[PDB]
Amino acid sequence: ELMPRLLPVSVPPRTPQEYLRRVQIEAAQCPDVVVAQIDPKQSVNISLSGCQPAPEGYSPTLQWQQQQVAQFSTVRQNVNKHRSHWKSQDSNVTMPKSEDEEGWKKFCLGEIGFPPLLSIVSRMNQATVTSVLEYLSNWFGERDFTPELGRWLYALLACLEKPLLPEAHSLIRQLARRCSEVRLLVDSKDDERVPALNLLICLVSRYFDQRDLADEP
């Protein structure tokens, strides 16, 4: 159905059914499709960006990407397998609340911070994983990319369980953009950041199905 029937079946009609038959006539008469040619302007839809391509030479090889996407899966496989074991152990580690952006930022990078141990990540629920990725994106917007961050992002990703929420899809995109952008600043291939940025772009585009963003060489 798109238009279901609710009611049944030259001088005015005295009975309803006789009316509706009569109507059924007059409209069947009528042209189902009509087109009114006319003669003589638009609003804008702020669709977001994609990902900034790599400078010539820097974009990584499909084989490598493919290898990274493969291995990551094994990680994530292992991460899943032994979640329960690491769920139960934790000497220092005052794990901030899911609400505490500023406290979760210092926790991870500090102001130095805790790395992502399985003991520490395996306790964090999906909602926290999400939030923590976000703050770490926010700390990225406003600061230099560090390997603490890279491992932290990477690890948050490994724990990120799909099917992803559309919210989490969008967050990892915004992230990868920053990577691709922060990539434009590089002056030599031997830069620490380069490969790290490339990975995080890679895993998102290929592992997390966000292919429009991917590095094609």
Binding site: P60, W64, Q67, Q68, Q71, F72, V75, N78, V79, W86, P115, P116, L117, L118, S119, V121, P147, G150, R151, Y154, A155, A158, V194, P195, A196, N198, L199
Partner: peptide, 17 residues
């Protein structure tokens, strides 16, 4: 292996060449 996530990332980064 608790630092295993760290080593993976590390391994993964060091693969780029």
């Amino acid at each position: 292996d608790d630092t295993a996530l760290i080593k993976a990332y590390d391994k993964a980064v060091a693969s780029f060449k």
